[PDB]
Write a protein that binds this ligand. Structure first.
Ligand SMILES: CS(=O)(=O)N(CC(N)=O)C1CCCCC1
Ligand SMILES: [Cl-]
Ligand SMILES: [Cl-]
Ligand SMILES: [Cl-]
Ligand SMILES: [Cl-]
Ligand SMILES: [Mn+2]
Length: 340
């Protein structure tokens, strides 16, 4: 039977089933006011799937100049063609190699650049914006989005959306690394998985993906989405309540000191965007500071709602294309106020 919703993270995470259901707000707003993230599945079935393929991005935009990051060591690969990234998205033997001769795990940095998404890709922009869930919250001019309505006493988000493109992490050592490191945003955001690329050549890399999800602390119902429904998993997220950010800063100041970093006692390890919380650090956060998070596996077509001020990190299981839009809900506008 079709149902309006279900629960993940043992009842702590709302999962809405129909992205275009006009009654979603009634269930959504109760969870959202308490500072929880929310998941909405099925957004891929609303989109024009031909507009979101890596081969199309390569063919249409391949000649533009970009920087990449090596996700294993944070090295920057300067001033290469965007086709050098896209043509290795799923075919492993086409990927740029490190000195060791291994194919690199790469992230495409700031592409499209700044606020240029709408100008460069007007048809993609239309397809996405017209199919975002909770549109009174997420559309540029929706009635519950205060972005366009606030004075300069509030930090206003840039014009979006922003695209996030990166390969999947592969090895046991890769389990300890992030695609995007732990950080927080002063605005709310919705992040949609529009494409998951399962590669070929080293195409049989299914079992380390399971160990990563398991060690990632994913719930039993989330593991049933793979084994029972054969949905494509993109990325493993950890999200923490805005109210726990200072306890996370205290853990990361202590670990920094243990590892011989030499940091003033007030510096901000979350703003630095330099940490990924691996299994050891997440267990220590829980045991020593009493802080619990949400471990979320974002499948193809899943939209993750991230509350303003909530620390979060992203670990790609396979190659992913994500598109995110910022918004300012009245529930969380305190997070972007420039005084007290
Ligand atoms: C110190 S901070 O965490 O960077 N911060 C203060 C601010 N004025 O932006 C806000 C960040 C969003 C959540 C509420 C706090
Ligand atoms: Cl809050
Ligand atoms: Cl376009
Ligand atoms: Cl809505
Ligand atoms: Cl990062
Ligand atoms: Mn973010």
């Amino acid at each position: 039977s079709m149902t309006s919703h279900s629960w993940l993270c043992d009842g702590r995470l709302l999962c809405l089933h129909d992205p275009s259901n006009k009654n979603n707000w009634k269930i959504f707003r109760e969870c959202w006011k308490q500072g929880q993230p929310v998941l909405v599945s099925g957004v891929h079935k609303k989109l024009k799937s031909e507009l979101w393929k890596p081969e199309a991005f390569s063919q249409e935009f391949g000649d533009q100049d970009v920087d990449l990051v090596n996700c294993r060591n944070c090295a920057i690969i300067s001033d290469v063609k965007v086709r050098d990234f896209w043509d290795g998205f799923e075919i492993i033997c086409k990927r740029l190699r490190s000195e060791d001769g291994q194919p690199m795990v790469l992230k495409l940095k700031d592409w499209p650049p700044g606020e240029d998404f709408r100008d460069m890709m007007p048809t993609r922009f239309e397809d996405l914006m017209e199919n975002l869930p909770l549109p009174e919250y997420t559309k540029r001019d929706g009635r519950l989005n205060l972005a366009s309505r606030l004075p300069s006493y509030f930090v206003r988000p840039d014009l979006g959306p922003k695209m996030y493109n990166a390969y999947g992490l592969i090895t046991a050592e890769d389990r300890r690394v992030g695609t995007t490191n732990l950080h927080l945003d002063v605005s709310d955001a919705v992040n949609v998985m529009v494409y998951v690329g399962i590669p070929i050549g080293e195409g049989a890399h299914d079992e380390e993906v399971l160990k990563t999800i398991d060690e990632g602390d994913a719930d039993e119902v989330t593991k049933e989405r793979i084994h029972d429904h054969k949905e494509k998993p993109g990325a493993l997220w950890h999200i923490y309540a805005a109210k726990d950010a200072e306890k996370i800063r205290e853990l990361l100041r202590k670990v920094g000191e243990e590892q011989g970093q030499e940091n003033p006692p007030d510096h901000d390890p979350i703003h630095d965007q330099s940490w990924y919380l691996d299994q050891t650090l997440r267990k220590r956060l829980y045991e020593e500071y009493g802080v619990q998070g949400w471990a979320i596996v974002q499948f193809l077509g899943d939209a993750v709602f991230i509350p303003a001020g909530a620390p979060h990190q992203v670990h790609n299981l396979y190659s992913c294309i994500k598109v995110a839009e910022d918004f300012v809900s009245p529930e969380h506008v305190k997070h972007c106020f420039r005084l007290t």
